[PDB]
Curated annotation (Swiss-Prot), chains A, B:
It catalyses: 2 superoxide + 2 H(+) = H2O2 + O2. One of its GO terms (molecular function) is metal ion binding. The gene is sodB. It comes from Porphyromonas gingivalis (strain ATCC BAA-308 / W83). Its EC number is 1.15.1.1. Homodimer. This is Superoxide dismutase [Mn/Fe]. Binds 1 Mn(2+) or Fe(3+) ion per subunit. Mn(2+) binds at H27, H74, D157, H161. Keywords: Iron, Manganese, Metal-binding, Oxidoreductase. It holds the Pfam family Sod_Fe_N. InterPro entries: Mn/Fe_SOD (IPR001189), Mn/Fe_SOD_BS (IPR019833), Mn/Fe_SOD_C (IPR019832), Mn/Fe_SOD_N (IPR019831), Mn/Fe_SOD_N_sf (IPR036324), SOD_C_sf (IPR036314). Belongs to the iron/manganese superoxide dismutase family. The keyword Metal-binding applies.
Length: 191, 191
């Protein structure tokens, strides 16, 4: 199979200033393209030749896993954002967040803290199990909740390339701004 | 024990375009300052409290190690560069490199590759053991050779903050460009 560089569901400048047009150009256009290209090369001659991305992330290791995990993480990351959105979650997800974290505000506080305290490169993930129980997962480097059987709902990329051009070392400030571009309709759909 | 922010032996714009003025300001002025302040705040209460940098690094763990290792990594990193240096190593080191890697060009190729293939944040290190044996070590996140009892000679920081402002995703190009600002006279002295 040939894994693809996903086409974005919005214009490249649609998430500015939180994820600037320049950041989308390098993050999506260069980093993700590299992950996809490396993944396509590394799976040739392995048991993942004809596997779907999800299967490769659940089973692979080493370099293959690093590129697979990164491809999946970015695919979910870019597709969960939209301009003119943000706001608070609703429906079952909104109620699940309220019941399990107390309030949306408290949830954001814990999520931001998990993202800020993750040392080095990685991802902070909001994930659910088969019963709807939510958890905040800290995933170093290429980690993804799917490697644990969990459902990936919302992720903040804390690899420095996700925010350095606009925020430099201010990771916390970037995380606080990400909430403004989250499309909760999309996250809710994953739940 | 409570350390400080080392002084740069050159002007902040002296390494352009390899390490830009803004990068030095953020890398040295913000990132390293934070590692230093965090280290000072963490010595209190433990055993490594009162211990010189090298010892803290080889003896500490968790957050204390994370900040001591990064402080030591950066101190060695910033001081090994100089505008107008570069070139090739001489003396015992230059000979050790040819004998152990074949040639300086080959060593650089190996070094560059180790840096480019280190997944996530980290450091590529040229280290020496007690018998003078040289090795290229990939140190993820805050790793440093001093932790294995080795002599840290030369390091390229591959945390993205070290190059993103100028090179964005082009890590490989950044590593190729770093050779022009390495002060082999300083590296030799550590060997
Ligand atoms: Mn990313
Ligand atoms: Mn650094």
């Amino acid at each position: 199979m040939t894994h693809e560089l996903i086409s974005l569901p919005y214009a490249v400048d649609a998430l500015a200033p939180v994820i600037s047009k320049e950041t989308v150009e390098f993050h999506h256009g260069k980093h993700l393209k590299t992950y996809v290209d490396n993944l396509n090369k590394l799976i040739i001659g392995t048991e993942f030749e004809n596997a779907d991305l999800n299967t490769i992330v659940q089973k692979s290791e080493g370099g293959i896993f690093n590129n697979a995990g990164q491809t999946l993480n970015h695919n979910l990351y870019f597709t969960q954002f939209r301009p003119g959105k943000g706001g608070a979650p609703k429906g079952k997800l909104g109620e699940a967040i309220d019941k399990q974290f107390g309030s949306f505000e408290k949830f954001k506080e814990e999520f931001n803290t998990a993202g800020t305290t993750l040392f080095g490169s990685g991802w902070v993930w909001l994930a659910s199990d088969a019963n709807g129980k939510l958890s905040i997962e800290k995933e170093p480097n290429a980690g993804n909740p799917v490697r644990k059987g969990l459902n990936p709902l919302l992720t903040f990329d804390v690899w420095e390339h996700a925010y350095y051009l606009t925020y430099q070392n201010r990771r916390a400030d970037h995380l606080k701004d990400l909430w403004s571009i989250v499309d909760w309709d999309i996250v809710e759909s994953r739940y």
